[PDB]
Amino acid sequence: KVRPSVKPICEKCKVIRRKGKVMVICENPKHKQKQG
Amino acid sequence: SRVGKKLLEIPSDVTVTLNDNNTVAVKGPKGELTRTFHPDMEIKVEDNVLTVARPSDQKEHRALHGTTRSLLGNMVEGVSKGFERGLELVGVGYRASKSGNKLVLNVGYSHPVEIVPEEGIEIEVPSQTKVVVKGTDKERVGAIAANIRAVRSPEPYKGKGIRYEGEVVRRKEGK
Amino acid sequence: MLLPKRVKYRREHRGKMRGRAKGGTEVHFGEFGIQALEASWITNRQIEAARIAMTRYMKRGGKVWIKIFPSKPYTAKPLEVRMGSGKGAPEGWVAVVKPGKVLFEISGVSEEVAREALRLASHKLPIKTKFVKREEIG
Amino acid sequence: AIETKKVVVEEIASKLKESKSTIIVDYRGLNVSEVTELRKQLREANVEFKVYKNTMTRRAVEQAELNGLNDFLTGPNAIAFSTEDVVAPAKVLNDFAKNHEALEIKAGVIEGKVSTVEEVKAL
RNA sequence: GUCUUGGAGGUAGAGCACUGAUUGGACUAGGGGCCCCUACCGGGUUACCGAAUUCAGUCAAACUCCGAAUGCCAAUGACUU
RNA sequence: AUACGUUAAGUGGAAAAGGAUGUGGAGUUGCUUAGACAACCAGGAUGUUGGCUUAGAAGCAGCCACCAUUUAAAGAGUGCGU
RNA sequence: UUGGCACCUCGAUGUCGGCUCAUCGCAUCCUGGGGCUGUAGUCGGUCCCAAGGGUUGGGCUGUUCGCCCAUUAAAGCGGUAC
Ligand SMILES: [Mg+2]
Ligand SMILES: [Mg+2]
Ligand SMILES: [Mg+2]
Ligand SMILES: [Mg+2]
Ligand SMILES: [Mg+2]
Ligand SMILES: [Mg+2]
Ligand SMILES: [Mg+2]
Ligand SMILES: [Mg+2]
Ligand SMILES: [Mg+2]
Ligand SMILES: [Zn+2]
Incomplete structure (x- = not known):
């Protein structure tokens, strides 16, 4: 899932940075999203 | 702290x-x-x-x-x-087996698959449906176990294929 | 849809929009409000859209206060036509907003819920905003 | 840390009256088991079992300014308060025997508390 | 040209005193609607339209109780050209 | 060249609404050796699922403001749920 | 693309369709590699990387358009004085 506006959805999502990009990982794979 | x-x-x-x-x-x-x-x-x-x-x-x-x-x-x-990590092999007839020093497996594929380790990492099949890596370097045995598991990742609808030694896998259903 | 009931003239200059707001820069009909930060026009319908969204989010306990009001009309010529030979026909209604104005005011609900409602309303306006609450000292 | 001093001196009045008291291991305690124990109190000794469980070992080392110089081996350790305000544990000893030999919460680290300088071998 | 001094004029800005536009309260006979019962009285409401009026609050190229900086017109002195 | 700061993108050497534990300053402010936040050991109910409706709804068919006591807290359910 | 302006060309810058020959971009039609799925499997839906190669014969109209017949893995969209 890719979009320019990434932000948590559930209560236990998380926000990180990999290779200068913004990412969000969570248990439910449907939440996994990456900015740009 | x-x-x-x-x-x-x-x-x-x-x-x-x-x-x-x-x-x-x-x-x-x-x-x-x-x-x-x-x-x-x-x-x-x-x-x-x-x-x-x-x-x-x-x-x-x-x-x-x-x-x-x-x-x-x-x-x-x-x-x-040293360290080690077991590997579960769920299958419905899948099963592994040692040979010489290398390791072969028979998942539902149409041919056998083989994995050979390097030095310092001994593989061992205690039961023909359970594998345990073993070695001195932690990251190296981690890498070997990952290579093995990467042959057949577990399947959601039915736990099938390789699996780390105890871990929760998601589970959907078909009809 | 907000619009005057009768106007003197129907076509009218557009005019410049420099400088801060004359007055009405302090919330005094409620507890919280959004304050503009850069000049623009606000269309007749943008206002009502923001208002409906904001009032739906709230549990109707509070009340709202639309401060601004569209009065200036603006024209537009028909499509695919050369230039000149008469000003166009009046089309809609806008309301100029210079920085420092206070567009909306809420009162009757908790602080954070009003903050959320105002943030949700902000995303319908063509400008950048800021959440500001009632000056207690007056 | 306002009322910490307050309660750590307040426990002096409740500790000076009795002779003997008792301690209970803290963790592995079900609050269903805790409420069963509370109702067992209510039928045996209503609230006299000190269910005050919001204290840091300073509570007992500042209650030790008079006596009872033993919590140093219980403070930094599982603690569930209690006391024996009524006469020496001729009854509550066997009460605790039947309530923690195999019941709501284990016995484990329990050594009771001070009647006199002693800690164990009560009856 | 500059310094000094004196004039005319309603822009920028501001303001609601006039003319239009406009928000929220107070308050309303006149009740509109509900009705009690209104066939008709009289009465809660009037959801008043509550008209004004009043209390606060925003606007204007063809609104102004106000109102600059500049520019313009002269003077008699001075210093330069 | 001198002196002190900033940026790690080749920004420098092209753009916005919006998004973000990037990073430097200036603050405001809570908790805290009476021990903080983590992490690990514990637990998280009683006329009590109470007057409940749809099979228990015993956690969330969804009506109670499904309240009050045992304390040490338990919301007679945070979410996962079932 | 439909438009707006009238800056170059009126002592000449010759239109639309088709034929021959092509070449470039990628916002991808096929083939290659993946994430998620309201993905059982075989089919799919959507999004990410990818421009190497490939991308049809007829009927009706001057026709680009368009409809239809029969196939193919596929019958891509655009620029180069349409
Ligand atoms: Mg979104
Ligand atoms: Mg004012
Ligand atoms: Mg003005
Ligand atoms: Mg004027
Ligand atoms: Mg650059
Ligand atoms: Mg010529
Ligand atoms: Mg691409
Ligand atoms: Mg051509
Ligand atoms: Mg062209
Ligand atoms: Zn999530």
Whole structure:
């Protein structure tokens, strides 16, 4: 899932940075999203 | 708190030899390990005293001052007794088997698949439906186990294929 | 849809929009409000859209206060036609907003819920905003 | 840390009256088991079992300014308060025997508390 | 040309005193609607339209109780050209 | 060249609404050796699922403001749920 | 693309369709590699990387358009004085 506006959805999502990009990982794979 | 300050002890068998350029190695009851570290990062060892001296506080220094300590602990632990990790093989008729030194598996594919390890990592099939890697270096046995598991990742609708030794897998349903 | 009931003139200059707001820069009909930060026009329908969204989010306990009101009309010529020979026909209604104005005011609900409602309303306006609450000292 | 002093001196009045008291291991305690124990109190000794469980070992080392110099081996350790305000544990000893030999919460680290300088071998 | 001094004029800005536009309260006979019962009285409401009026609050190229900086017109002195 | 700061993108050497534990300053402010936040050991109910409706709804068919006591807290359910 | 302006060309810058020959972009039609799925499997839906190669014969109209017949893995969209 890719979009320019990434932000948590559930209560236990998380926000990180990999290779200068913004990412969000969570248990439910449907939440996994990456900015740009 | 902070991990870069916990002091490391040294069991009697562990004979670590500090060397210049942070090229320290180690000797113990299971073999040898060695790693060179960041130059400016300071390390000095006394008997059961691992002095991870950190230079001026920065970002990279605050990172290395922890990472080096963690790796040193891992290394002494490995050379003491090493690590391992089991591998579950669920299947419905899938099963593995040893051969010579290498390892072969028969998942539902139309042909056998084989994996050979390098030195220092012994594979062992205690039961023909269970595999256990074993070796001294933690990251290396991790890599080997990952290679194995990567042959047939588990399946959601029915737990099928390789699986780490105990872990929760999602579970949907078809109809 | 807000619009005057009768106007003197129907076509009218557009005019410049420099300088801060004359007055009405302090919330005094409620507890919280959004304050503009850069000049623009606000279309007749943008206002009602923001208002409906904001009032739906709330549990109707509070009340709202639309401060601004569209009065100036603006024209537009028909499509695919050369230039000149008469000003166009009146089309809609806008309301100029210079920085410092206070567009909306809420009162009757908790602080954070009003903050959320105002943030949700902000995303319908063509400008950048700021959440501001009632000056207690007056 | 306002009322910490307050309660740590307040426990003096409740500790000076009795002779004997008692301690209970803290963790592995079901609050269903805790409420069963509370109702067992209510039928045996209503609330006299000190179910006050919001204290840091300073509580007992500042209650030790008079006597009871033993919590140093219980404070930094599992603690579930209690006391024996009524006469010496001729009854609550066997009460605790039947309530923690195999019941709601284990006995484990329990050594009771001070009647006199002693700690164990009560009856 | 500059310094000094004196004039005419309603822009920028501001303001609601006039003319239009406009928000929220107070308050309303006149009740509109509900009705009690209104066939008709009289009465709660009037959801008043509550008209004003009043209390606060926003606007204007063809609104102004106000109103600059500049520019313009002269003077008699001075210093330069 | 001198002196002191900033940026790690080749920004420098092209753009917005919006998004973000990037990073430097200036603050405001709570908790805290009576021990903080983590992490690990514990637990998280009683006329009590109470007057409940749809099979228990015993956690969330969804009506009670499904309240009050045992304390040490338990919301007679945070979420996962079933 | 439909438009707006009228800056170059009126002592000449010759239109639309088709034929021969092509070449470039990628916002991808096929083939290659993946994430998620309201993905059982075989089919799919959507999004990410990818421009190497490939991308049809007829009927009706001057026709680009368009409809239809029969196939193919596929019968891509655009620029180069449409
Ligand atoms: Mg969105
Ligand atoms: Mg005002
Ligand atoms: Mg003006
Ligand atoms: Mg004027
Ligand atoms: Mg650049
Ligand atoms: Mg010629
Ligand atoms: Mg692409
Ligand atoms: Mg052509
Ligand atoms: Mg062109
Ligand atoms: Zn999530």
